[PDB]
Amino acid sequence: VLVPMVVEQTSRGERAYDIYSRLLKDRVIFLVGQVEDHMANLAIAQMLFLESENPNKDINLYINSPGGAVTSAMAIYDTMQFVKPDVRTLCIGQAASAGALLLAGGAKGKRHCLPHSSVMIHQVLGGYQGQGTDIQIHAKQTQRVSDQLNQILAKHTGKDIERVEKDTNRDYFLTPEEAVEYGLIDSIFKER
Amino acid sequence: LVPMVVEQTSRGERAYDIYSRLLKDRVIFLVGQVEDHMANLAIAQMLFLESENPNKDINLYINSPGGAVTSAMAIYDTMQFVKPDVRTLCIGQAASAGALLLAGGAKGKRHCLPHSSVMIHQVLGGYQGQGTDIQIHAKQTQRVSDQLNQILAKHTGKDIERVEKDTNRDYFLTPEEAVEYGLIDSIFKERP
Amino acid sequence: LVPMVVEQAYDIYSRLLKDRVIFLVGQVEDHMANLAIAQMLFLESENPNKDINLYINSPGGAVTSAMAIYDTMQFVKPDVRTLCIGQAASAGALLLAGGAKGKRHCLPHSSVMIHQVLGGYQGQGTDIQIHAKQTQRVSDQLNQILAKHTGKDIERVEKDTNRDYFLTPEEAVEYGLIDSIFKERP
Amino acid sequence: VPMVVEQTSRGERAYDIYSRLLKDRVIFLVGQVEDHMANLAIAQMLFLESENPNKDINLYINSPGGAVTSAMAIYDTMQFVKPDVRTLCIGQAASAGALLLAGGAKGKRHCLPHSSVMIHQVLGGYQGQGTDIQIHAKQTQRVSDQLNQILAKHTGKDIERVEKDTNRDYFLTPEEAVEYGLIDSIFKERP
Amino acid sequence: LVPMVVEQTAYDIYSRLLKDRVIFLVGQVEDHMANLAIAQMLFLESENPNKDINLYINSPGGAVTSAMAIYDTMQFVKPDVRTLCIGQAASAGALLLAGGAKGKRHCLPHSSVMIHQVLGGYQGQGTDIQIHAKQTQRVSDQLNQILAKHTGKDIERVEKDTNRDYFLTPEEAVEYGLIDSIFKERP
Amino acid sequence: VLVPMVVEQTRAYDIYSRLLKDRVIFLVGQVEDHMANLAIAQMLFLESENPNKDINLYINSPGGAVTSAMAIYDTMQFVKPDVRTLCIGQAASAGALLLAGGAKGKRHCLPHSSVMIHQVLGGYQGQGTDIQIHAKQTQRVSDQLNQILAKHTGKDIERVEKDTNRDYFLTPEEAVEYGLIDSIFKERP
Amino acid sequence: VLVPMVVEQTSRGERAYDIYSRLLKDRVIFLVGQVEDHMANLAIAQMLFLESENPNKDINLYINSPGGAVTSAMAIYDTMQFVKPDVRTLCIGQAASAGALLLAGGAKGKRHCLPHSSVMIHQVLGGYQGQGTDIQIHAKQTQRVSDQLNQILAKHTGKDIERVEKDTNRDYFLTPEEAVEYGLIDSIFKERP
Amino acid sequence: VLVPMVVEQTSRGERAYDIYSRLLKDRVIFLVGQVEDHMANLAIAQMLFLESENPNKDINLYINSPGGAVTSAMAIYDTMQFVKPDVRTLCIGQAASAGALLLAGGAKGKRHCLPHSSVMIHQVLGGYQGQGTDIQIHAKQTQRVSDQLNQILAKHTGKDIERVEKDTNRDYFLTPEEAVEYGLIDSIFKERP
Amino acid sequence: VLVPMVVEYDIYSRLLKDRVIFLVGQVEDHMANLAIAQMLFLESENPNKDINLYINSPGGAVTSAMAIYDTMQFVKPDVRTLCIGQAASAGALLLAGGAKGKRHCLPHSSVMIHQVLGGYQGQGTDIQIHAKQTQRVSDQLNQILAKHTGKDIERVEKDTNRDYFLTPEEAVEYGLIDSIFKERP
Amino acid sequence: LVPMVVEQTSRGERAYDIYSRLLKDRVIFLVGQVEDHMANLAIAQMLFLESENPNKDINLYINSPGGAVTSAMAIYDTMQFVKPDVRTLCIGQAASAGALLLAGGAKGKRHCLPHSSVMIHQVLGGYQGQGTDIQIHAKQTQRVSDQLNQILAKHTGKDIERVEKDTNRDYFLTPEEAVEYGLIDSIFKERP
Ligand SMILES: [Ca+2]
Ligand SMILES: [Ca+2]
Ligand SMILES: [Ca+2]
Ligand SMILES: [Ca+2]
Ligand SMILES: [Ca+2]
Ligand SMILES: [Ca+2]
Ligand SMILES: [Ca+2]
Ligand SMILES: [Ca+2]
Ligand SMILES: [Ca+2]
Ligand SMILES: [Ca+2]
Ligand SMILES: [Ca+2]
Ligand SMILES: [Ca+2]
Ligand SMILES: [Ca+2]
Ligand SMILES: [Ca+2]
Ligand SMILES: [Ca+2]
Ligand SMILES: [Ca+2]
Ligand SMILES: [Ca+2]
Ligand SMILES: [Ca+2]
Ligand SMILES: [Ca+2]
Ligand SMILES: [Ca+2]
């Protein structure tokens, strides 16, 4: 018996050997689309699996995400600090605020992007409906999440939390060079 | 299916919807969910009655099982603005927004019937967006909340803290309990 | 100069309102409840001494709504005579029963039916309890009112309305919900 | 829905067509018999009785369907008001409408030559607990019995015979309907 | 005093034409409009039992069972009902056009008249299917009888022609007997 | 006595129409084109009836587009009568512009009124060239709003710009202090 | 995304696992998304399977659940105590009320979270619609489930039931440090030990 | 939500299994979710299969059902009594009336639940719409099914039919302890020391 | 040993190996044809051993049942029918059409027979054409039931006029089944 | 609906979807609308082919009638990033996003077929929100617009200003025109 090859899985997630799974064999994880719990947990599971196979080889996180929730990315971020392997981050195309958090939370020296990548950070978004008392409770928790995002970004970039809080107030786009300069990445894999 | 009434005017025969006819007796119906559209109609009715006679009482009949306090706010203010005393009678239901209006009637002129149901609770609200905006809207919600407590305290004779505690959750009052609470002044079994 | 119509602005119901007849038909719900109450107050305003005639044909709707109509009935000065033309389901039967002593009637193929209050809530446990308590109070109120107007014991009413309880016109006279049946108008 | 205008001492007064026909003590019972239109019809009879409790009321019927429970209220109203209620079936009298047609005053029930009369047993339904199902089932049996008693009363047939016929959709030509006792005669042209 | 409009949405255009004893039968013939047309004839008869009523028909479809009522109403009211097809008379409308008073059934030069058998349908138990199928056969028979009567054709001839959609030019319709004459311009 | 009386439309003489006789206009609900043109029409009619008597504009609006408010604002400066503004309940940003743009000394609110101001909102979708064209037009509308509030409140344009960057709620007292309104009425004067 | 596969090539041949089944091999179970009956049962099955394989090795329950019903979690909680293996619990990201219950219900000393995890507890939600009599019946049952939740939290945290009943009256967020202090977990892991 | 799988070392080689199919190998069947015809037939098929493998070893039915129709439960119940193996029943979480019927119908002495399980029984529900004659036909059938449920519960709990009928008139929740006392189950698998 | 195992072979495929076929859900064309194809496959594997049809069907059309029934009489193997839970009209036909002496239900099984349903919409001429066909099918149902139960066609027609529920015992008495199993015999 | 192929591996028979089989010949299909999901699938395929053999050419077969330029951007960077020369062939349509990848193939290795349609145009975008945020997204859209011009200029040899002018509106090119313009190098009728 040999496992069947597909480029893409059929609508049923047939247990066929898809292209992403073949890249997983080289320790490459793809983080794409909206960052939300479903895909997030699948990414966390791939890191745990990669760490189980070899806790000493780098894991490569390839990021192309135009959007999504920072609270979802949060679990992925913690997963990356938790597992033993260094996690290399490369932004292939887009890194929006959830995605940029992970890009930035890569191992020191091992965060990159490509020449036309688009990185962008902004403050957490939330929402609540209900009694005032509960609105106050959820509002405080959102303030907490917002502070955590600033602290995480401050830590990996080298910036002040006050500076990061200021920059993330509205959508803040960074060219690749600006992103190196900001400290969100270490270098651009320039055209060779 | 609103019924009409034809009156014989000095100038001739005139049709009235039932509510226009009762308006001729300075009765205003405040019914259904308290929301902006009906709030404004009730307010316009009060200003009309004030224009017809600045001195005769206005009678505001209340039967409202729900709705927003912010909507009730404009009506409450209109009540204090207009010159005529506003007598308030709860025919059936007066949930939070309704209870605000009922209680804000003219001293000694707030009433309900024997099976009326009165219920007060804290304000509800909600917002969705950036954390900064969530904070801004939470603060305004806190203020509207305090306003509701101040208004009930003022009209019932209770302390603000007492009112805050009682509205923390849905708080039902029998007619008797509502008199004792100071939300109304007396109950009418049959017309006085 | 006002237009004349059977239905729509001077409709058939407004014409009957001139004869102090009010129709209470369809599902008993807040909108039609308040309109009914308004006509009673209007009729009281015209003449607080002549009877008001409440014609009932309602196959359902919420007792909490009927509650306001009931209270209005006892509030206004005029005697309210009640006739069930076709159907009086539970909210409608409350109003049927709550008419003036001696002045509650039905037609021979009328259907009267009583049952306990319906309710519902969704949310936190604490709030469920708060709302369950209020439903029990509304439920006791329904029993008390039916008891008062029929002469039955509260417990007996409570037991009978536990489930849908249909009453023929004759059973309804016997029960105390109405005072008499009309074959043809006296 | 057309409007008719009439001259008064005090100006022009406008009427929809049915309000104008009401002026001739004609009431139209058409479409599905359900509560809304049933009550409107009862309201018209009460009004006409109020205007003159002694002149006939004319009920014109064209109803291809609807619920017997709704027809019940109209039927009782008809026996309740003092005026004779003459019934004419212009086109269709399906079960609920057939009830009303038959329940007109003796000697004053009619149809036109291509009218279609049809009678059937009551329909219903309930969803819930077994105990509740039995309660509603009994009430349904009762309403069904009432329908049979009403037809039996106005036709001269026995209830066992009415019950048998209404078991399934039972169509009658106008002649068969005279012979059945549902109507008294057919009008070829206005007599 | 009373307000004037062309269209409802209140004296309107149709109401004004009603004052000259003109009734419009337009759109799909179904119960609602059928009953309105019937009421209008009853009203016109009431105003004057002796003057003709004018039924202007422009109907591209609808159920014969609804038309049946109108037809019986036409023969029931005292006044002669003159019929004119301004545009279309599909089978239900054609039955009405054809059932106008002798000598008083007309159409315009580009009118389209079309007759066909009754349509129907039922769903349920076999016994009920059988029951409704017989009734449909009865109604289908009544349509043929009515058309034969007014056109002068044998019932069998009508039954054959109507077995499928049968279009008739104005001329063909005079010749067939559905109408008596064509008007180019108002005579 | 021909004309029938109703409290609510849906024609008849409704309660709003009766207040129009006393030169009172209600500006309620969302501020958008349809109601804006109705409000502008009422103003033209009132001016036509008497060019010199005040027009009273009662405002209770929780939101809406500034661009639609713009038209109402221009109408208010265009007609000859002084327009008195009173905020009965809510005056969100489109409403607040109208509230603040009433005649000098004749702008008011009630004690639990909520006034709130914020920068314009907008949006476009299409080719880059067109996005730039519409973005420039949004900037202009945004400037016009800062200019109008500056004019009527006495604040600097740069101060108004900063304050409206995000939703900015004012109590009636803060609103008097800001210059959006001239006074508060507890009860009618 | 779609669910990645792991193919282990072997001299024997080759075998294919989805990523979750591959981690099952290492006695790791994921409890993610809304806690509801469907995934609850899959999680219970997985615990029974692991017990079957070896009743003495720890089972690892990784939790990332931002919500869901406490009645659905109850079945998982009972399964955790029922199976022989100790169940270690780690909150990777979110544990709302139902998830918080399973987190706290892990074997003594083997309950953890990561530095930015969010733990949150609240009283049970419920709802019924129908006759008064039935509303009373379901309200009582809700009161019982609500007490049950309080008792379980009291049991595993060391807190008084009345204390827990007061804390869960409204949504109660805990930072990892507060969750340790409260007794819902035993320690926080910055990096895998 | 996605069913994990396992790979086992079989006689002709290694084969995959979904988790439920692997627990099938230990004679465990999961009855979860709403009881309705589709899952009912799967469960019966699983029982017939297990009987076919070994007619003499116990079958284990793990139940977590919050609702569903007694008429669907009927087929499962009868299949339980039909197949040769004793059918042990265990309520892991919830057993609403259709589930409770299957719980109670397990082999003598082999019916259980866990400490926070919820067992609930009520009379049958139904409904019909149509001609009166037909309504009468369907209400009698409903009465028969209603009597069958009472007779089945009575047999297995030892109660009187009249007592069962009275108790199920409305939703009747039992704690695990009451369920033991009632006769629905035989014992609770309490948390080991 | 290569092929994966699931409960949802799949479980029904594994039971197919023991010559068991499930007829469950609404009887309609899709599932009817799968049932038929399974009978043909079983016949092809072994034309002599019984086929076992387990029936649990609360509804469906008689015209789809018709095909299954003919298949049953067509294939060489005896078809044993067991009603595990429900067998409404369409299913009852199949239950009653099992091989003589090999038709069974369980103690709480619900069997129910009724006349054919149908309907048509169109021109009068076509309504008549389809009504007659409906009458033919209605007669075919009665003749099949009379053949297998032993009852007169007139008797079957009267009984099936409206929904006619039979207890297991009544169904043995009626001729629809041969015996009731308490436990596997 | 995707066909399978069974091959005789040295390790036994293996099933391939048609695309995975063509992957064995270093052929990748880029088809349909360009959007993130398919873009990431194509990038993974390039990463996988590089991993198999970093020196052999990758063959990118393009048939895309539309899609977002921002999505294409990730693919274009991937193409410059991986070590193998990427030969591009337009089988049918290359709309603006597709055209960007066609033109971005390796020097001398960009082609189309005789009835191919190539069309370029400026980026589309859009945003909804506060004015400040509108200006922010507008600047970013301008930047992406300039990037697209600079990439097309680089690969065609045209001046940026000329490209900017030409792409102002939909600009269709015949194969011959596309050779002349520098978007491709040659046209094949029959394979050479
Ligand atoms: Ca966010
Ligand atoms: Ca790490
Ligand atoms: Ca006042
Ligand atoms: Ca509120
Ligand atoms: Ca009274
Ligand atoms: Ca009926
Ligand atoms: Ca009479
Ligand atoms: Ca005539
Ligand atoms: Ca037809
Ligand atoms: Ca001729
Ligand atoms: Ca705006
Ligand atoms: Ca001015
Ligand atoms: Ca354990
Ligand atoms: Ca809960
Ligand atoms: Ca057994
Ligand atoms: Ca049930
Ligand atoms: Ca059938
Ligand atoms: Ca055979
Ligand atoms: Ca390259
Ligand atoms: Ca684009």
Tab-separated table of C-alpha atoms in Angstrom, chain J residues 15-124:
chain	number	residue	atom	x	y	z
J	15	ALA	CA	-2.363	6.919	-7.267
J	16	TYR	CA	-2.009	10.557	-8.318
J	17	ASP	CA	-4.574	13.218	-9.041
J	18	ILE	CA	-3.923	14.483	-12.565
J	19	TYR	CA	-2.214	17.600	-11.162
J	20	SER	CA	0.138	15.660	-8.824
J	21	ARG	CA	1.097	13.471	-11.770
J	22	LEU	CA	1.945	16.592	-13.792
J	23	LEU	CA	3.811	17.835	-10.726
J	24	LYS	CA	6.143	14.886	-11.342
J	25	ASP	CA	7.101	16.652	-14.594
J	26	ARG	CA	7.553	19.980	-12.802
J	27	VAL	CA	4.338	21.434	-14.184
J	28	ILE	CA	2.157	23.673	-12.015
J	29	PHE	CA	-1.292	24.902	-13.087
J	30	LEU	CA	-2.328	28.449	-12.214
J	31	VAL	CA	-6.013	28.711	-13.160
J	32	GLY	CA	-9.315	30.401	-12.331
J	33	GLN	CA	-9.504	33.590	-10.292
J	34	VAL	CA	-6.266	34.438	-8.544
J	35	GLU	CA	-7.053	34.608	-4.856
J	36	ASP	CA	-5.279	33.620	-1.661
J	37	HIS	CA	-6.388	30.002	-1.472
J	38	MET	CA	-5.143	29.022	-4.927
J	39	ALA	CA	-2.182	31.390	-4.669
J	40	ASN	CA	-0.918	29.597	-1.568
J	41	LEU	CA	-1.448	26.228	-3.231
J	42	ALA	CA	0.730	27.299	-6.162
J	43	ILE	CA	3.408	28.725	-3.881
J	44	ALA	CA	3.526	25.441	-1.928
J	45	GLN	CA	3.972	23.615	-5.245
J	46	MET	CA	6.896	25.827	-6.143
J	47	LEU	CA	8.469	25.302	-2.710
J	48	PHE	CA	7.997	21.551	-3.127
J	49	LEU	CA	9.575	21.447	-6.608
J	50	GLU	CA	12.554	23.460	-5.351
J	51	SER	CA	12.911	20.941	-2.552
J	52	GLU	CA	12.872	18.032	-5.037
J	53	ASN	CA	15.361	19.652	-7.376
J	54	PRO	CA	16.559	23.240	-7.014
J	55	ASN	CA	18.141	23.459	-10.490
J	56	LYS	CA	15.577	22.082	-12.886
J	57	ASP	CA	13.058	24.542	-14.375
J	58	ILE	CA	9.590	24.829	-12.953
J	59	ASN	CA	6.844	25.059	-15.572
J	60	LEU	CA	3.993	27.403	-14.684
J	61	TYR	CA	0.945	27.017	-16.971
J	62	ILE	CA	-1.367	30.012	-16.690
J	63	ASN	CA	-5.080	30.312	-17.490
J	64	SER	CA	-6.609	33.020	-15.292
J	65	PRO	CA	-9.387	35.432	-16.401
J	66	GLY	CA	-9.159	37.608	-13.283
J	67	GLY	CA	-8.338	38.165	-9.638
J	68	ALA	CA	-6.584	40.475	-7.213
J	69	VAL	CA	-3.070	41.755	-7.848
J	70	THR	CA	-2.280	41.629	-4.105
J	71	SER	CA	-2.883	37.839	-4.220
J	72	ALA	CA	-0.649	37.442	-7.267
J	73	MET	CA	2.083	39.372	-5.441
J	74	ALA	CA	2.815	36.469	-3.101
J	75	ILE	CA	3.170	34.118	-6.088
J	76	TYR	CA	5.434	36.536	-7.980
J	77	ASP	CA	7.783	36.868	-4.989
J	78	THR	CA	7.768	33.089	-4.547
J	79	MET	CA	8.868	32.768	-8.166
J	80	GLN	CA	11.824	35.107	-7.653
J	81	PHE	CA	12.645	33.438	-4.329
J	82	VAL	CA	12.867	29.764	-5.358
J	83	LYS	CA	16.120	28.816	-7.044
J	84	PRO	CA	14.764	27.173	-10.236
J	85	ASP	CA	13.993	29.244	-13.308
J	86	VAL	CA	10.236	29.440	-13.677
J	87	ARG	CA	9.121	29.094	-17.303
J	88	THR	CA	5.679	30.619	-17.895
J	89	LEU	CA	3.177	29.646	-20.537
J	90	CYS	CA	-0.209	31.217	-21.004
J	91	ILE	CA	-2.521	28.503	-22.263
J	92	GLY	CA	-5.573	30.726	-22.595
J	93	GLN	CA	-6.189	33.865	-20.580
J	94	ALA	CA	-3.965	36.005	-18.446
J	95	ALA	CA	-5.813	38.923	-16.888
J	96	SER	CA	-4.004	41.454	-14.842
J	97	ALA	CA	-2.989	39.247	-11.939
J	98	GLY	CA	-2.208	36.369	-14.276
J	99	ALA	CA	-0.345	38.729	-16.570
J	100	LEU	CA	1.906	39.787	-13.716
J	101	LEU	CA	3.015	36.182	-13.214
J	102	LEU	CA	3.323	35.523	-16.935
J	103	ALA	CA	5.603	38.550	-17.360
J	104	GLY	CA	7.495	37.646	-14.201
J	105	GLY	CA	8.748	34.333	-15.554
J	106	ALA	CA	12.457	33.759	-16.194
J	107	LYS	CA	14.124	35.754	-18.976
J	108	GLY	CA	13.515	34.152	-22.365
J	109	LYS	CA	11.153	31.612	-20.854
J	110	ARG	CA	7.814	33.403	-21.034
J	111	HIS	CA	5.381	32.289	-23.731
J	112	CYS	CA	1.792	31.986	-24.866
J	113	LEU	CA	-0.273	30.073	-27.404
J	114	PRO	CA	-1.736	31.589	-30.611
J	115	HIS	CA	-5.269	32.404	-29.320
J	116	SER	CA	-4.213	33.452	-25.827
J	117	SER	CA	-5.544	36.696	-24.393
J	118	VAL	CA	-3.271	38.881	-22.279
J	119	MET	CA	-4.643	41.915	-20.462
J	120	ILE	CA	-3.075	44.288	-17.904
J	121	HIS	CA	-4.630	46.969	-15.680
J	122	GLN	CA	-3.962	49.045	-12.559
J	123	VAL	CA	-4.756	47.632	-9.130
J	124	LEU	CA	-8.280	47.737	-7.792
